[PDB]
Amino acid sequence: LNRWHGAGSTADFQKIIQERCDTYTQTIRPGSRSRNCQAIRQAFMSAFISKDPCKATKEDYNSLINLAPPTVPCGQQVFWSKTKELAHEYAKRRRLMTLEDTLLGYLADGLRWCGEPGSSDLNIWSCPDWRKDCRTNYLSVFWEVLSERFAESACNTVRVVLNGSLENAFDSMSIFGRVQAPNLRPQVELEAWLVHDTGKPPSDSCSGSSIRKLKSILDGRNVKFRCMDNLSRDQFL
Amino acid sequence: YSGLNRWHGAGSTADFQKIIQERCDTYTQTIRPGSRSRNCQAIRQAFMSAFISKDPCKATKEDYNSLINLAPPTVPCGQQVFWSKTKELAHEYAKRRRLMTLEDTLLGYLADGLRWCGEPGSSDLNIWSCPDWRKDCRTNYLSVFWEVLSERFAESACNTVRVVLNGSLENAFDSMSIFGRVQAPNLRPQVELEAWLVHDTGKPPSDSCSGSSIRKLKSILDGRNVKFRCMDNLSRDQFLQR
Ligand SMILES: *[C@@H]1O[C@H](CO)[C@@H](O[C@@H]2O[C@H](CO)[C@@H](O)[C@H](O)[C@H]2NC(C)=O)[C@H](O)[C@H]1NC(C)=O
Ligand SMILES: *[C@@H]1O[C@H](CO)[C@@H](O[C@@H]2O[C@H](CO)[C@@H](O)[C@H](O)[C@H]2NC(C)=O)[C@H](O)[C@H]1NC(C)=O
């Protein structure tokens, strides 16, 4: 059970998911119809429990995603890469939604989970690491599937918060670069904001090499691109 | 005969557990959302635990303490409505005015209109018969639930409370009603209570604020140091448009 190279499952995973579901559905974003959180938790567990944790497929999450698809109103989506804290504060203030503001994203944010064949329990010792063990693991596949659907459903103007205090604000291998940007629909307009740390000069900008790669992706998607830069965390918020 | 059909009251509502579950989700997510979260699985499990497999004529208030702790029947100050013998009117009034009766609390909403009881040695509801308060036992799980919920609802009342009473009855205040026996005597001291005695359209009222039964209520409220204002000679439509 301790054979993997990543940290083990969040031990109270089931309780945490269900509690977050209650908070989300009742307190944060109550919906047009009720959703049963026990059933959502049950579907989450069933996706991965008692399975080879290195044989995860997108299909395994079909039932779960169908119970709570990560869709948001047009013009209200926020994407981010390497700017977790900033992007979520920005989204909170402007009443916008990141992936972590969707039901399933809110449930899963910051958690780890995996199973073991022949066992009905979470593996709390270790779980597959995406580098050292396998990319076809249940944590990575969940976030890719969720990211795909989140990106696919974007409409009108979307925003991405990128880190202007890094050498490369755009990382082609990030989930944003690999899964989200390539799945935006034509006629979406994407605005990128390259935001730097207060009191520090930016390390990347809209005229840099990494942004060229992003524009290349978006041009092929027929996604309009407007890139802003040279602003600090304070100016952005 | 000593089997499942031995009681004089109607049996448990079929599929009680499904109904509870569905009502709890509806209530917490669509009726009164924005509020602090409640765990509906836990609430259902606590409700069942309170009575299942127990002597159906030995219910006590304490059997429901864990359920009430999960969702106390507390209403915001100034929004609470009591009623007696005016079920339809009181709930229409509460709906139109965005106020809350006992049946508008989480637990009151789950249980309204339902029946339930268990059977010793069984994990299931008795869907065949349940104890009747008058013919079998007062200390049954259905009656005791409404009694303890009523007490907690009255004890937590704050600021101005309103009661809707029936001006078309000879005695609008019945000391042996749940309102008269359990709710009024347990009102938080120093709240203020307004009573409205409402009569049916086109029928002259049968009771008023000056009658003997309202005097009995006044005496109870004086005991609780609760200020009392009573208004009468109103039809349903006059009351709703006040
Ligand atoms: C750009 O990314 C860097 C590197 O992750 C962020 O700096 C870290 O921020 C965390 C959380 O605030 C700190 O605990 C770390 O100590 C920081 N590490 C380093 C190397 O500085 C930075 O906040 C990001 N900037 C923006 C604007 O999002
Ligand atoms: C006062 O109480 C009477 C008696 O319960 C109510 O009249 C009953 O109303 C129910 C539901 O509307 C009917 O099914 C019964 O047939 C009625 N019975 C009688 C004797 O009329 C009346 O609605 C109450 N009035 C107010 C203002 O609440």
Coordinates of C-alpha atoms and ligand atoms in Angstrom, one line a residue:
Chain A
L1 CA 0.0 0.0 0.0
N2 CA 3.0 2.3 0.6
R3 CA 4.4 1.3 -2.8
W4 CA 3.6 4.6 -4.5
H5 CA 5.6 7.8 -4.6
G6 CA 2.8 10.4 -3.8
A7 CA 1.2 11.2 -0.5
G8 CA -1.7 8.9 0.5
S9 CA -5.4 9.7 0.4
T10 CA -6.9 12.4 2.5
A11 CA -8.1 10.2 5.4
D12 CA -11.5 11.8 6.0
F13 CA -12.1 12.1 2.3
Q14 CA -15.7 10.9 2.3
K15 CA -16.7 13.1 5.2
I16 CA -15.0 16.1 3.7
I17 CA -16.5 15.7 0.3
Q18 CA -20.0 15.4 1.7
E19 CA -19.6 18.3 4.1
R20 CA -18.3 20.5 1.3
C21 CA -21.2 19.4 -0.9
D22 CA -23.7 20.4 1.9
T23 CA -22.0 23.8 2.2
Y24 CA -21.9 24.3 -1.5
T25 CA -25.4 23.3 -2.3
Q26 CA -27.1 25.0 0.7
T27 CA -24.9 28.0 1.7
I28 CA -22.7 29.0 -1.2
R29 CA -24.5 28.3 -4.5
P30 CA -27.9 26.9 -3.9
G31 CA -29.3 25.6 -7.2
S32 CA -32.6 25.7 -9.1
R33 CA -33.3 22.1 -7.9
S34 CA -31.9 20.2 -5.0
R35 CA -29.0 17.8 -5.5
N36 CA -28.5 14.9 -3.0
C37 CA -25.0 15.2 -1.5
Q38 CA -24.9 11.7 -0.2
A39 CA -25.5 10.4 -3.7
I40 CA -22.8 12.7 -5.1
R41 CA -20.3 11.4 -2.5
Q42 CA -21.3 7.8 -3.4
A43 CA -20.7 8.5 -7.1
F44 CA -17.3 10.1 -6.3
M45 CA -16.2 7.0 -4.3
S46 CA -17.5 4.6 -6.9
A47 CA -15.4 6.2 -9.6
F48 CA -12.1 5.0 -8.1
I49 CA -12.6 2.7 -5.0
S50 CA -11.3 -0.9 -5.4
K51 CA -9.7 -0.1 -8.8
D52 CA -6.0 -0.1 -10.0
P53 CA -5.0 3.4 -9.2
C54 CA -2.8 3.6 -12.3
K55 CA -5.5 2.5 -14.7
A56 CA -7.8 5.5 -14.3
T57 CA -9.8 6.6 -17.4
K58 CA -11.9 9.6 -18.2
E59 CA -14.9 7.3 -18.6
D60 CA -14.6 6.4 -14.9
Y61 CA -15.9 9.9 -14.0
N62 CA -18.8 10.0 -16.5
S63 CA -21.5 9.4 -13.8
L64 CA -20.0 11.9 -11.4
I65 CA -19.6 14.7 -13.9
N66 CA -23.1 14.0 -15.2
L67 CA -24.4 14.6 -11.7
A68 CA -22.8 18.0 -11.4
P69 CA -21.4 19.4 -14.6
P70 CA -18.8 22.3 -14.1
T71 CA -20.7 24.9 -16.1
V72 CA -20.8 28.6 -15.5
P73 CA -22.7 31.5 -17.0
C74 CA -21.2 33.2 -20.1
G75 CA -18.5 35.8 -19.4
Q76 CA -18.0 34.6 -15.8
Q77 CA -15.2 32.1 -16.0
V78 CA -11.7 32.6 -14.7
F79 CA -8.8 30.4 -15.7
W80 CA -5.4 30.5 -13.9
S81 CA -2.0 29.0 -13.9
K82 CA 0.6 29.4 -11.1
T83 CA -1.5 32.2 -9.5
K84 CA -3.8 30.1 -7.3
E85 CA -4.1 32.6 -4.4
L86 CA -4.4 35.7 -6.6
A87 CA -6.9 34.2 -9.1
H88 CA -9.3 33.0 -6.4
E89 CA -9.2 36.3 -4.5
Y90 CA -9.9 38.1 -7.8
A91 CA -12.8 35.8 -8.7
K92 CA -14.2 36.1 -5.2
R93 CA -14.1 40.0 -5.4
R94 CA -15.6 40.2 -8.9
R95 CA -18.3 37.5 -8.4
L96 CA -16.7 35.3 -11.1
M97 CA -16.0 31.5 -11.0
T98 CA -12.8 29.5 -11.2
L99 CA -12.8 25.7 -11.6
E100 CA -12.6 25.5 -7.8
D101 CA -15.9 27.4 -7.6
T102 CA -17.8 24.7 -9.4
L103 CA -19.5 22.0 -7.3
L104 CA -17.0 19.2 -8.1
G105 CA -14.0 21.6 -8.1
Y106 CA -15.0 22.9 -4.7
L107 CA -15.4 19.3 -3.4
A108 CA -12.0 18.1 -4.6
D109 CA -9.8 21.2 -4.1
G110 CA -6.7 20.3 -2.2
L111 CA -7.6 16.7 -1.6
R112 CA -5.9 13.4 -2.6
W113 CA -7.5 10.1 -3.2
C114 CA -6.9 6.6 -4.6
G115 CA -8.0 3.0 -4.1
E116 CA -6.5 -0.5 -4.2
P117 CA -7.9 -3.5 -6.1
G118 CA -9.9 -5.9 -3.8
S119 CA -10.3 -3.2 -1.1
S120 CA -13.3 -1.0 -0.4
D121 CA -11.1 1.5 1.5
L122 CA -9.0 4.6 0.5
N123 CA -5.3 3.9 0.4
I124 CA -4.1 6.2 3.1
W125 CA -0.4 5.2 2.9
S126 CA 0.5 6.4 -0.7
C127 CA -1.1 7.2 -4.1
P128 CA 0.4 7.3 -7.6
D129 CA 2.5 10.3 -8.4
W130 CA 1.9 11.7 -11.9
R131 CA 5.7 11.9 -12.6
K132 CA 7.1 8.9 -10.7
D133 CA 4.3 6.4 -11.0
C134 CA 1.7 7.1 -13.8
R135 CA -0.3 9.9 -15.3
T136 CA -3.4 7.7 -15.6
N137 CA -4.1 8.1 -11.9
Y138 CA -7.5 9.1 -10.4
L139 CA -6.4 12.5 -9.1
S140 CA -4.8 13.7 -12.4
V141 CA -7.6 12.2 -14.6
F142 CA -10.3 13.9 -12.5
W143 CA -8.8 17.3 -12.9
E144 CA -8.2 16.9 -16.6
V145 CA -11.8 15.7 -17.2
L146 CA -13.2 18.5 -15.1
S147 CA -10.9 21.0 -16.8
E148 CA -11.9 19.8 -20.3
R149 CA -15.6 20.3 -19.5
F150 CA -15.0 23.7 -17.8
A151 CA -13.1 25.0 -20.8
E152 CA -15.5 23.5 -23.4
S153 CA -18.4 25.4 -21.8
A154 CA -16.8 28.8 -21.7
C155 CA -18.7 31.5 -23.7
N156 CA -18.2 35.2 -24.4
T157 CA -15.3 36.8 -22.6
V158 CA -13.1 34.6 -20.4
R159 CA -10.1 35.7 -18.3
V160 CA -6.9 33.9 -17.4
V161 CA -4.7 35.0 -14.5
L162 CA -1.0 34.3 -15.2
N163 CA 2.1 34.9 -13.2
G164 CA 4.3 37.8 -14.4
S165 CA 6.8 37.1 -11.7
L166 CA 7.8 33.9 -13.4
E167 CA 10.3 33.4 -16.3
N168 CA 7.4 32.0 -18.4
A169 CA 4.0 33.2 -17.5
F170 CA 2.6 30.6 -19.9
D171 CA 3.6 26.9 -19.4
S172 CA 2.6 24.7 -22.3
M173 CA 2.6 21.7 -20.1
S174 CA 0.3 23.1 -17.4
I175 CA -3.2 21.9 -17.2
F176 CA -4.2 25.4 -18.5
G177 CA -1.9 25.0 -21.5
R178 CA -2.5 21.4 -22.3
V179 CA -6.2 20.8 -21.5
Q180 CA -8.0 24.1 -21.0
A181 CA -6.8 26.5 -23.7
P182 CA -6.9 23.9 -26.5
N183 CA -10.6 23.2 -25.6
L184 CA -11.9 26.8 -25.8
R185 CA -14.7 27.2 -28.4
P186 CA -14.4 29.5 -31.4
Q187 CA -15.7 33.0 -30.8
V188 CA -14.7 32.9 -27.1
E189 CA -12.5 35.9 -26.4
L190 CA -9.7 35.3 -23.9
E191 CA -8.1 38.1 -21.9
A192 CA -4.8 37.2 -20.2
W193 CA -3.6 39.2 -17.3
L194 CA 0.1 38.8 -16.4
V195 CA 0.3 40.0 -12.8
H196 CA 3.6 40.4 -10.9
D197 CA 4.4 40.4 -7.1
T198 CA 4.2 43.7 -5.3
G199 CA 7.4 45.6 -5.2
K200 CA 9.1 43.4 -7.8
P201 CA 9.7 44.0 -11.5
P202 CA 8.0 41.6 -13.8
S203 CA 10.0 38.7 -15.2
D204 CA 7.7 38.0 -18.2
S205 CA 5.3 40.0 -20.4
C206 CA 2.9 39.9 -23.3
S207 CA 5.7 40.2 -25.8
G208 CA 7.6 37.3 -24.4
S209 CA 8.2 33.8 -25.9
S210 CA 5.8 31.9 -23.7
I211 CA 2.8 34.1 -24.6
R212 CA 3.7 33.5 -28.3
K213 CA 2.9 29.8 -27.7
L214 CA -0.4 30.6 -26.1
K215 CA -1.4 32.9 -29.0
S216 CA -0.5 30.1 -31.4
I217 CA -2.9 27.8 -29.6
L218 CA -5.7 30.3 -29.6
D219 CA -5.2 31.3 -33.2
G220 CA -5.8 27.7 -34.2
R221 CA -9.0 27.6 -32.0
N222 CA -10.3 30.8 -33.6
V223 CA -10.3 32.4 -30.1
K224 CA -9.7 36.1 -30.0
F225 CA -6.8 37.1 -27.6
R226 CA -6.2 40.3 -25.6
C227 CA -3.1 40.3 -23.4
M228 CA -2.5 42.7 -20.6
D229 CA 0.7 42.9 -18.5
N230 CA 3.0 45.0 -16.2
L231 CA 0.6 45.2 -13.3
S232 CA 1.0 44.2 -9.7
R233 CA -1.2 42.0 -7.5
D234 CA -2.5 45.3 -5.9
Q235 CA -3.5 46.9 -9.2
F236 CA -5.1 43.7 -10.5
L237 CA -7.4 43.3 -7.4
Chain B
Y1 CA -54.6 -10.1 19.2
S2 CA -51.3 -8.4 19.9
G3 CA -49.8 -7.8 16.4
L4 CA -48.9 -4.8 14.1
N5 CA -52.5 -3.8 13.7
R6 CA -53.2 -3.5 17.4
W7 CA -53.2 0.3 17.5
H8 CA -56.2 2.6 16.9
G9 CA -54.4 5.2 14.8
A10 CA -53.5 5.1 11.2
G11 CA -50.2 3.4 10.2
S12 CA -46.9 5.1 9.3
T13 CA -46.7 7.0 6.1
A14 CA -45.4 4.7 3.4
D15 CA -41.8 5.4 2.3
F16 CA -41.3 7.8 5.2
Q17 CA -37.6 7.7 4.8
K18 CA -37.7 8.8 1.2
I19 CA -40.1 11.6 2.1
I20 CA -37.9 12.8 4.9
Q21 CA -34.8 12.7 2.6
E22 CA -36.5 14.5 -0.2
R23 CA -38.0 17.2 2.0
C24 CA -34.7 17.9 3.7
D25 CA -32.9 18.5 0.4
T26 CA -35.8 20.6 -0.8
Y27 CA -35.8 22.7 2.4
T28 CA -32.1 23.2 2.8
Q29 CA -31.4 24.0 -0.8
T30 CA -34.4 25.6 -2.3
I31 CA -36.8 26.8 0.4
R32 CA -34.5 28.3 3.0
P33 CA -31.0 28.3 1.5
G34 CA -28.2 30.7 2.1
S35 CA -28.4 29.5 5.7
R36 CA -25.7 27.6 7.7
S37 CA -25.5 24.1 6.2
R38 CA -27.3 21.1 7.7
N39 CA -26.4 17.4 7.0
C40 CA -29.6 15.8 5.7
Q41 CA -28.3 12.3 5.8
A42 CA -27.5 12.8 9.5
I43 CA -30.9 14.4 10.1
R44 CA -32.8 11.5 8.5
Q45 CA -30.7 8.9 10.4
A46 CA -31.3 10.8 13.8
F47 CA -35.0 11.0 13.1
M48 CA -35.2 7.2 12.5
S49 CA -33.0 6.4 15.4
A50 CA -35.2 8.5 17.8
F51 CA -38.1 6.0 17.5
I52 CA -37.2 2.9 15.5
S53 CA -37.4 -0.5 17.4
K54 CA -38.6 1.3 20.6
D55 CA -41.8 0.8 22.6
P56 CA -44.2 3.0 20.6
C57 CA -46.0 4.1 23.8
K58 CA -42.9 5.1 25.8
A59 CA -41.7 8.1 23.8
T60 CA -40.0 10.8 25.8
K61 CA -38.9 14.4 24.9
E62 CA -35.3 13.3 25.4
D63 CA -35.5 10.7 22.6
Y64 CA -35.6 13.7 20.2
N65 CA -32.8 15.8 21.7
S66 CA -30.2 14.6 19.2
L67 CA -32.5 15.3 16.2
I68 CA -33.4 18.8 17.5
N69 CA -29.7 19.5 18.0
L70 CA -29.0 18.9 14.4
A71 CA -31.7 21.4 13.3
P72 CA -33.3 23.4 16.1
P73 CA -36.7 25.0 15.3
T74 CA -35.4 28.6 15.7
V75 CA -36.9 31.4 13.7
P76 CA -35.4 34.9 13.3
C77 CA -36.6 37.6 15.7
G78 CA -39.9 39.1 14.6
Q79 CA -40.7 36.5 12.0
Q80 CA -42.4 33.8 14.1
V81 CA -46.0 32.8 13.8
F82 CA -48.1 30.6 16.2
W83 CA -51.5 29.3 15.3
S84 CA -54.3 27.2 16.7
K85 CA -57.4 25.8 14.8
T86 CA -56.5 28.0 11.8
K87 CA -54.1 25.8 9.8
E88 CA -55.0 26.9 6.3
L89 CA -55.2 30.6 7.1
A90 CA -52.1 30.7 9.3
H91 CA -49.9 29.1 6.6
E92 CA -51.3 31.4 3.9
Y93 CA -50.5 34.4 6.1
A94 CA -47.0 33.2 6.8
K95 CA -46.4 32.5 3.1
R96 CA -47.7 36.0 2.0
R97 CA -45.7 37.7 4.7
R98 CA -42.5 35.6 4.5
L99 CA -43.0 34.6 8.2
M100 CA -42.4 31.2 9.7
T101 CA -44.8 28.8 11.5
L102 CA -43.6 25.6 13.3
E103 CA -44.2 23.8 10.0
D104 CA -41.8 26.2 8.3
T105 CA -38.8 25.2 10.4
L106 CA -36.6 22.4 8.9
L107 CA -37.9 19.7 11.3
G108 CA -41.6 20.9 11.1
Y109 CA -41.3 20.9 7.3
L110 CA -40.0 17.3 7.2
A111 CA -42.7 16.0 9.5
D112 CA -45.8 18.0 8.5
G113 CA -48.7 15.7 7.6
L114 CA -46.7 12.5 8.2
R115 CA -47.3 9.6 10.6
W116 CA -44.7 7.3 12.1
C117 CA -44.1 4.7 14.7
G118 CA -41.9 1.6 15.2
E119 CA -42.2 -1.8 16.7
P120 CA -39.9 -3.4 19.3
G121 CA -37.5 -5.9 17.6
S122 CA -38.1 -4.4 14.1
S123 CA -35.8 -2.1 12.1
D124 CA -38.8 -0.8 10.1
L125 CA -41.7 1.6 10.5
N126 CA -45.1 0.0 11.4
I127 CA -47.1 0.9 8.3
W128 CA -50.2 -0.9 9.6
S129 CA -51.3 1.0 12.7
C130 CA -49.8 3.5 15.1
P131 CA -50.8 4.6 18.6
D132 CA -53.7 7.1 18.9
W133 CA -53.1 9.8 21.5
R134 CA -56.6 9.5 23.0
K135 CA -57.3 5.7 22.7
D136 CA -53.8 4.2 23.1
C137 CA -51.2 6.5 24.7
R138 CA -50.3 10.2 24.8
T139 CA -46.6 9.2 25.0
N140 CA -46.3 8.1 21.4
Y141 CA -43.5 9.2 19.1
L142 CA -45.7 11.4 16.8
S143 CA -47.3 13.3 19.6
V144 CA -44.1 13.7 21.6
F145 CA -42.2 15.0 18.5
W146 CA -44.7 17.9 18.0
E147 CA -44.8 18.6 21.8
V148 CA -41.0 18.9 22.1
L149 CA -40.6 20.7 18.8
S150 CA -43.3 23.1 20.0
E151 CA -41.5 23.7 23.3
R152 CA -38.2 24.5 21.7
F153 CA -40.0 26.8 19.1
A154 CA -41.7 28.7 21.9
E155 CA -38.6 28.9 24.1
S156 CA -36.5 30.4 21.4
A157 CA -39.0 33.1 20.2
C158 CA -37.7 36.6 20.1
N159 CA -39.1 40.1 19.9
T160 CA -42.6 40.3 18.4
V161 CA -44.5 37.0 17.8
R162 CA -47.9 36.7 16.1
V163 CA -50.6 34.1 16.7
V164 CA -53.6 33.4 14.3
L165 CA -56.7 32.3 16.1
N166 CA -60.2 31.2 15.0
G167 CA -62.9 33.9 15.6
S168 CA -65.4 31.4 14.2
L169 CA -65.1 29.1 17.2
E170 CA -66.8 29.6 20.5
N171 CA -63.4 29.5 22.2
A172 CA -60.6 30.8 20.1
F173 CA -58.1 29.9 22.8
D174 CA -58.3 26.2 23.9
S175 CA -56.1 25.6 27.0
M176 CA -55.8 21.9 26.0
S177 CA -54.7 22.6 22.4
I178 CA -51.0 22.2 21.6
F179 CA -50.8 26.0 21.4
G180 CA -52.5 26.4 24.8
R181 CA -50.9 23.5 26.7
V182 CA -47.3 23.6 25.3
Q183 CA -46.5 26.7 23.2
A184 CA -48.0 29.6 25.1
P185 CA -46.8 28.4 28.6
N186 CA -43.3 28.0 27.3
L187 CA -42.9 31.4 25.4
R188 CA -39.6 33.1 26.2
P189 CA -40.3 35.7 28.8
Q190 CA -40.6 39.4 27.7
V191 CA -41.4 38.7 24.0
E192 CA -44.4 40.6 22.7
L193 CA -47.3 38.7 21.4
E194 CA -50.0 39.9 19.0
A195 CA -53.1 37.7 18.5
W196 CA -55.4 38.0 15.6
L197 CA -58.9 36.4 15.9
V198 CA -60.1 35.9 12.3
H199 CA -63.6 34.7 11.4
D200 CA -64.9 33.2 8.2
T201 CA -66.3 35.3 5.4
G202 CA -69.9 36.3 5.9
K203 CA -70.3 34.6 9.3
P204 CA -70.5 36.8 12.4
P205 CA -67.7 36.0 14.9
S206 CA -68.3 33.5 17.7
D207 CA -65.4 34.6 19.9
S208 CA -63.5 37.9 20.4
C209 CA -60.7 39.5 22.4
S210 CA -63.1 40.2 25.2
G211 CA -64.2 36.6 25.7
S212 CA -63.4 34.2 28.5
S213 CA -60.9 32.0 26.6
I214 CA -58.7 35.0 25.5
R215 CA -58.7 36.0 29.2
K216 CA -57.1 32.7 30.0
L217 CA -54.4 33.3 27.4
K218 CA -53.9 36.8 28.8
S219 CA -53.4 35.2 32.2
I220 CA -50.8 32.8 30.9
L221 CA -48.9 35.7 29.1
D222 CA -49.0 37.9 32.2
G223 CA -47.3 35.0 34.0
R224 CA -44.5 35.0 31.3
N225 CA -44.2 38.8 31.4
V226 CA -45.2 38.9 27.8
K227 CA -47.0 42.0 26.5
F228 CA -50.2 41.1 24.7
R229 CA -52.1 42.9 22.0
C230 CA -55.3 41.4 20.7
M231 CA -57.2 42.2 17.5
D232 CA -60.5 40.7 16.4
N233 CA -63.6 41.2 14.2
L234 CA -61.6 40.6 11.0
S235 CA -62.5 38.4 8.1
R236 CA -59.8 36.4 6.4
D237 CA -59.4 39.0 3.6
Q238 CA -59.4 41.9 6.1
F239 CA -56.7 40.1 8.1
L240 CA -54.5 39.4 5.1
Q241 CA -54.8 43.0 3.9
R242 CA -54.1 44.6 7.3
Ligands
LIG1 C1 3.9 33.7 -8.8 O1 4.4 32.4 -8.4 C2 5.2 32.4 -7.3 C3 5.9 31.0 -7.1 O2 4.9 30.1 -6.6 C4 4.4 32.8 -6.0 O3 5.3 33.0 -4.9 C5 4.9 32.1 -3.8 O4 3.7 32.4 -3.2 C6 3.4 31.5 -2.1 C7 1.9 31.8 -1.7 O5 1.6 33.1 -1.6 C8 4.4 31.8 -1.0 O6 4.1 31.1 0.1 C9 5.7 31.3 -1.6 O7 6.8 31.6 -0.6 C10 6.1 32.1 -2.8 N1 7.3 31.5 -3.5 C11 8.2 32.3 -4.1 C12 9.2 31.5 -4.9 O8 8.2 33.5 -4.1 C13 3.8 34.2 -6.3 O9 2.9 34.5 -5.3 C14 3.0 34.2 -7.7 N2 2.6 35.6 -7.9 C15 1.4 35.9 -8.4 C16 1.2 37.3 -8.7 O10 0.5 35.1 -8.4
LIG2 C1 -62.2 27.8 12.1 O1 -62.3 26.4 12.4 C2 -63.3 25.8 11.6 C3 -63.5 24.4 12.2 O2 -62.3 23.6 12.1 C4 -62.8 25.7 10.2 O3 -63.8 25.1 9.4 C5 -63.3 23.9 8.8 O4 -62.4 24.1 7.7 C6 -61.9 22.9 7.1 C7 -60.8 23.3 6.1 O5 -61.2 24.5 5.5 C8 -63.1 22.2 6.4 O6 -62.6 21.0 5.9 C9 -64.1 21.9 7.5 O7 -65.3 21.3 6.8 C10 -64.6 23.2 8.2 N1 -65.5 22.9 9.3 C11 -66.4 23.7 9.7 C12 -67.1 23.4 10.9 O8 -66.7 24.8 9.1 C13 -62.5 27.2 9.7 O9 -61.9 27.2 8.5 C14 -61.6 28.0 10.7 N2 -61.6 29.4 10.3 C15 -60.5 30.1 10.3 C16 -60.6 31.5 10.0 O10 -59.3 29.6 10.4

